[PDB]
Amino acid sequence: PRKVREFRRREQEILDTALKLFLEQGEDSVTVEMIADAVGIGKGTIYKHFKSKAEIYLRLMLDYERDLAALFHSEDVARDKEALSRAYFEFRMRDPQRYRLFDRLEEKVVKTSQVPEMVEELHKIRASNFERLTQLIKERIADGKLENVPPYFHYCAAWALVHGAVALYHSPFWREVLEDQEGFFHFLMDIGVRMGNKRK
Amino acid sequence: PRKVREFRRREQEILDTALKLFLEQGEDSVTVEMIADAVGIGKGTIYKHFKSKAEIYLRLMLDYERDLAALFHSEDVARDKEALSRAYFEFRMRDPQRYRLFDRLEEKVVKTSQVPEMVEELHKIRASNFERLTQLIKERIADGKLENVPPYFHYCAAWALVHGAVALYHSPFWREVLEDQEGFFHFLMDIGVRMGNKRK
Questions:
Q1: What b/e readout covers B57-68, taking b as 16+ CB neighbours within 10 angstroms?
Q2: Fewest 10 Å CB contacts: which of A186, B76, B82, B129?
């Protein structure tokens, strides 16, 4: 499996390197040559790893859902809720600058020359994760922690917050909160986990 | 006297009439001529009370803040919290399409070199309202309701939600949330009043 493991290493750095390159400067402002030079493998191996620039885009967005999927222990026997729900909220807001980037890339790629094999593969896992989210809510309404209301009361709520906070970390002058301020983050985590919780 | 009250009818009604027209039709798709006929008076009549269409915009946004100002009963000594905290959120989300209308209207022409005589009054009234909000936040940490963290931790949360919900009340598929479910509102109300509260 040795020829395999160094393939995955080379491929991963190119993915980690590239993400900084889009997040730094600009999403459109990078090319394979910049990513090739940032890793220094001379624009030929990266070609073998990923055929096009757009392929890296979705491979990032695919892997983003793979980790959110991996966060969901996916086997729903007992296990601790809330804490997984916290791991959810921590995950959604961990890189608000990355969040808005991925929205741009889906709006970019899907309309313009989408490589649909990964786009159509993507929506499947996104809809698969959505199911696991609504499932996570139902188990939490069953225990009695969360309030007994339709699960789209909640999944829309958990969506409205995460959409607003990322809009906070972005639109105005709140560059104070964006960097450091781990007491707003863990405060914001407690906001989501305690959102809709029942009080007698 | 009797001579006074009839000024207020035209101004109030035409503004109340007009506000509905933008939300139904479009903010830019309407003109004073339609608004003159929507209540059925001469355009010349509207002209004396209100100068141009673009100026009509801010008088709504001013009155929206004028009512929010009146809501914070700094006149009153007692000062009932929580219900005022709900009255805040109830006020902010009662017309989420109007919030985006005012947000969109600010994004539109009024921001760029149009009737600034009215524009700076808004910032003054908005910044004055901001004071009463952060004041209400601090007073509620005094009682022990909110968690003891810097008082704009909460104003940032309460802003991120209200920005997300308005984006939800605007989300593509949610035509039910506005009129079918009145129980989603009271769900968010219990969410807002109980947002950031301290535990044992």
A1: bbbbbbbbbeeb
A2: B76
Contact A61, A105 (CB under 8 A): yes
Bridge partners for B197 per DSSP: B146
**Tokens 């209540």, residue located:** B39
Chain A nearest CA to B165, separation (Å): 5
Burial class from Cβ neighbours inside 10 Å (0-12, 13-18, 19+) for residue B15 reads: middle
The residue assigned the tokens 């890296």 is A56
Distance from CA of A96 to the nearest CA of B (A): 13
Residue B165: its chain A contacts at CB < 8 A? Answer: 160, 164
Q: CB distance from A189 to chain B under 8 Å?
A: no
Q: Are A182 and A90 in contact (CB under 8 A)?
A: no
SS (H, E, C) chain A: CHHHHHHHHHHHHHHHHHHHHHHCCCCCCCCHHHHHHHHCCCCCHHHHHCCCHHHHHHHHHHHHHHHHHHHCCCCCCCCCCCHHHHHHHHHHCCCHHHHHHHHHHHHHHHHCCCCHHHHHHHHHHHHHHHHHHHHHHHHHHHHCCECCCCHHHHHHHHHHHHHHHHHHCCCCCCCCCCCCCHHHHHHHHHHHHCCCECCC
In sequence order, the 6+-apart residues with CB closer than 8 A to the CB of A39 are A13, A14, A17, A46
Amino acid at B97: Q
The domain locations on chain A are: 1-50, 51-200
Beta carbons within 8 Å of A167's beta carbon, 6+ residues apart? B160, B163, B164, B167
For this PDB entry, the determination method is X-ray
Interface of B with A in 137-176 (CB under 8 A): 147, 149, 153, 156-157, 159-165, 167-168, 171, 174
Helices (H), chain B: 2-24, 32-39, 43-49, 53-71, 83-93, 96-107, 116-143, 152-168, 176-179, 183-193
